[PDB]
């Protein structure tokens, strides 16, 4: 695929005793935060408790979202991980509490046990009886294997799936009874008289042998929000894709909660909770915090993980400044993980891993100068310079990045601090805060 910011992180890099390795699974350093995240990972994997708030706090460029993707990659498949930013709650068709309720309900997975029957064989005869206008459909299907033969009865969905991807009395099909899927595997009869309106070159498969009908147990995971949206109105399955779920009523949610508990009581389903990750949580109003404080106390509540990079700043919707941008009620019911700044060896290891992920070969002195500029400036700038220096070295037709390539990349592309310095000596050229600018050069 394509290379992203956290493409090198696959897991959390922990032992069996929840102890971090210095270099494992794309993560280097940050031992205490990784151990605390492993504790939160085991807390999610137990599935015993609900509604715990975790806050990840630190300065920028420290490894907050890196820790979040490490938790998500170590969480495994079939466990929901909902990642939202702070600004997605504000909608013109949904209230803030409704959007937060849907974000809470997307993170609880319902794993349903289903009994299905599979039928594979050769088609002998298809009879389809339709009305004159073509609305009512019924018919019979005659399917065979080596040992058995059975005439079945079809309904409207079966004829609709049979007319699509047309089967022609000698094809081998596989029928799933619970998912309603018709799958054509090939053709075995090799009919001599073919009225070729088509360019079919269908596969020569063998006729299957043995039992025609076979039972099978399947499992599939669905979300609580998806059951609510399906049960809300007549065409809610479309609204799972168009997002036309406008303020689902509370009665639907109470009945869905009771029915999910009932399905747990028969052993048909089970509840698999997950992680909701809210990045940049300071971009939320005070009403959202007041809703979260009481939405964390429900039976169906995930583990909420929040990331903040902000100090004592103004809480939105109010006129006072609070630590982390969050009110003290939300900070009362949260446990805080603190992440710390980096040394130079960690920056060097980060740059080496990010160079290995982009398949870009670096020299030693280029690595030291990139380490020095990632220490003086920020780390993300020195990570961004690598692909530019690779293209510069590819212009000269050699597949290794030298000091001259990264020096040219540093000259051509600017930092933040050099941009502040260049703007502050040339304030007349740029438009100020009062709208004044000198455009004429003399």
């Amino acid at each position: 695929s394509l290379i992203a910011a956290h493409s090198h992180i696959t897991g959390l890099g922990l032992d069996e005793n929840l102890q971090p390795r210095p270099t494992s699974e794309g993560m280097v350093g940050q031992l205490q935060a990784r151990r605390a995240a492993g504790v939160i990972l085991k807390m999610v994997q137990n599935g015993t408790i609900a509604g715990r708030a975790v806050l990840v706090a630190g300065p920028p460029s420290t490894g907050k979202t890196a820790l979040a993707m490490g938790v998500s990659q170590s969480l495994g498949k079939d466990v929901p991980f909902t990642a939202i930013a702070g600004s997605e709650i504000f909608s013109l068709e949904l209230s803030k509490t409704e959007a937060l309720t849907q974000a809470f309900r997307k993170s609880i997975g319902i794993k349903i046990k289903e009994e299905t029957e599979l039928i594979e064989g050769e088609v002998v005869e298809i009879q389809i009886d339709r009305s004159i206008t073509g609305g009512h459909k019924q018919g019979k299907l005659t399917i065979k294997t080596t040992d058995m033969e059975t005439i079945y009865e079809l309904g409207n969905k079966m004829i609709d799936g049979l007319t699509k991807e047309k089967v022609l009395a000698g094809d081998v099909i596989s029928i799933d009874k619970a998912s309603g899927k018709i799958t054509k595997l090939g053709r075995s009869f090799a009919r001599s008289r073919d009225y070729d309106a088509m360019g079919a070159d269908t596969r020569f498969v063998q006729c299957p042998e043995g039992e025609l009908q076979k039972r099978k147990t399947v499992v599939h995971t669905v979300s609580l929000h998806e059951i609510d949206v399906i049960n809300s109105r007549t065409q809610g399955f479309l609204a799972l894709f168009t997002g036309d779920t406008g303020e689902i009523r509370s009665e639907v949610r109470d009945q869905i909660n009771t029915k999910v508990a009932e399905w747990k009581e028969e052993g048909k389903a089970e509840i698999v909770p997950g992680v909701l990750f809210i990045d940049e949580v300071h971009m939320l109003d005070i009403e959202c915090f007041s809703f979260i404080n009481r939405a964390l106390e429900d039976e169906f509540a995930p583990i909420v993980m929040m990331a903040t990079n902000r100090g004592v700043s103004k809480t939105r919707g109010t006129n006072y400044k609070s630590p982390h941008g969050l009110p003290l009620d939300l900070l009362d019911r949260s446990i805080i993980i603190t992440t710390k700044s980096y040394n130079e060896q960690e920056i060097k290891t980060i740059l080496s891993i990010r160079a290995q992920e982009e398949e870009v070969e670096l020299s030693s002195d280029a690595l030291d100068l990139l380490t020095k500029t990632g220490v003086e400036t920020s780390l993300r700038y020195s990570s961004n310079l690598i692909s530019v220096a690779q293209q510069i070295a590819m212009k000269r037709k050699n597949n290794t990045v030298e000091v001259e390539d990264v020096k040219r990349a540093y000259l051509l592309f600017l930092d933040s601090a050099r941009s502040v310095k260049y703007v502050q000596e040339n304030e007349s050229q740029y438009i100020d805060d009062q709208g004044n600018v000198q455009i004429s050069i003399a």
Binding site: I49, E299, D332, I336
Partner: protein, 443 residues
């Protein structure tokens, strides 16, 4: 085994038959006078005589107000409707907030109706329509009547139908050999499934196979229903459930909250009163709980002073954690608990006091045995000292990281070293604030 979330160790108020609160009962520790006041409120709700009585639970953070609200809800039982609500939920983009408040007010009222139902049911034996004279006449249907023959145990009945019922019958997609169920109150038809009198193993449509229904085809049965007044208002405002075209297309349109008029609520009240007067229905008034009432602005409060004076209003319980704060929507009005003085005169305030070291220690004890964890005595003393030093909630949540850290060393018992390791790994508000004040770049 089972799941717990910040509650569910509370099973009731734990009062005696004289209303005296025992010290450690019902999952409650302390708060004796508040529990006694809430018990008197519970008896007042059970008396079923008053309307629009409002109380306010006033106290600091982490003092037991939401615990008292769920204790009242558990004392009243599953029959009495309880409507929990946060104050941020009233701000809807679809309808004005006044209508949301009145909708919750009507949702906090119950009704138990004994309704009779006329039922035709059986297995379809014949299905023969008779044709109209002129099908393309513009006015009138293509058919005139449909003859349906139903059989059951000790019975066989022949039904002549209008086209409007048969449209619903064919919308349910019946066939010969199907067990159906026809409701005469609304014209609804339910197709139960295939009959077991024929073969089963020759289908491909994952169907379910039912035996022949017992009794006669035509029946009258009694069903006890539990509805709210909001359900009646919503069902009458957006009509579905008839076989006429407007209710038929009301199921397909996307639902939207509307401003229900006073005339519709008066007519629904008249129908419910006529039901009660015939000995059929019974009224069960309930409780509306609004947590974080300081998030309301002055318009919702000013509407609360009018909505409390109705003769059908429920008992509304409010909760606040505010000292002498300005009301939202105002600039200069400063009031106790963030609630304006025109509403405070209509409330009865219940104080809720903080805790001591022993109460914190035993709260940690019950939260430990509900979460299925075993703690040493010295670790319990350290946790109680943390709860007095920082917060009760912080000592409450630190139990499960301690349990994980104890399990990861192949152990069951929680010791002091696990609590110290969880102290080091996880912080609280005060330590993080002290790191924030002494920091380089806004940490």
């Amino acid at each position: 085994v089972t799941r717990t979330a910040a509650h569910t160790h509370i099973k009731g108020l734990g009062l005696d038959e004289s209303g005296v609160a025992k010290r450690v009962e019902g999952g409650f520790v302390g708060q004796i006078e508040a529990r006694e006041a809430c018990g008197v409120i519970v008896d007042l709700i059970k008396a079923k005589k008053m309307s629009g009585r409002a109380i306010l639970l006033a106290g600091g953070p982490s003092t037991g107000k939401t615990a008292l609200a769920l204790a009242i809800s558990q004392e009243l039982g599953p029959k009495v409707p309880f409507c929990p609500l946060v104050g941020s939920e009233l701000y809807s983009v679809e309808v004005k907030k006044t209508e949301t408040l009145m909708e919750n007010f009507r949702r906090a009222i119950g009704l138990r109706i004994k309704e009779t139902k006329e039922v035709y049911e059986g297995e379809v034996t014949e299905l023969t329509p008779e044709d109209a004279e002129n099908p393309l006449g513009g006015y009138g249907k293509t058919i005139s009547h449909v003859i349906v023959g139903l059989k059951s145990a000790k019975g066989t009945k022949t039904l002549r139908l209008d086209p409007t019922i048969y449209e619903s019958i064919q919308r349910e997609k019946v066939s010969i050999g199907d067990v159906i169920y026809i409701e005469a109150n609304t014209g609804a038809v339910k197709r139960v499934g295939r009959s077991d009198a024929y073969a089963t193993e020759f289908d491909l449509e994952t169907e379910e196979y039912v035996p022949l229904p017992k009794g006669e085809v035509h029946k009258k049965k009694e069903i006890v229903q539990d509805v709210t007044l909001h359900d009646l208002d919503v069902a009458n405002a957006r009509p579905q459930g008839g076989q006429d075209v407007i209710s038929m297309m009301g199921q397909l349109l996307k639902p939207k909250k509307t401003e229900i008029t006073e005339k519709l609520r008066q007519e629904v009240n008249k129908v419910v009163a006529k039901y009660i007067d015939q000995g059929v229905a019974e009224l069960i008034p309930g409780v509306l709980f609004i947590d974080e009432v300081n998030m309301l602005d002055i318009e919702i409060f000013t509407y609360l002073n009018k909505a409390l004076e109705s003769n059908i209003a429920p008992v509304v319980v409010l909760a606040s954690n505010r000292g002498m704060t300005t009301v939202r929507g105002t600039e200069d009005v400063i009031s106790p608990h963030g609630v304006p003085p025109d509403l405070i005169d209509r409330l009865l305030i219940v104080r809720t006091l903080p805790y001591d070291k022993d109460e914190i220690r035993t709260i940690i004890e019950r939260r430990a045995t509900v979460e299925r964890l075993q703690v040493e005595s010295s670790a319990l003393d350290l946790l109680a000292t943390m709860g007095t030093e920082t917060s009760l909630r912080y000592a409450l949540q630190l139990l499960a990281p301690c349990g994980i850290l104890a399990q990861t060393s192949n152990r069951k018992e929680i010791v002091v070293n696990d609590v110290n390791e969880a102290k080091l790994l996880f912080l609280d508000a005060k330590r993080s604030t002290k790191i924030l004040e002494t920091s380089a770049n806004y940490l």
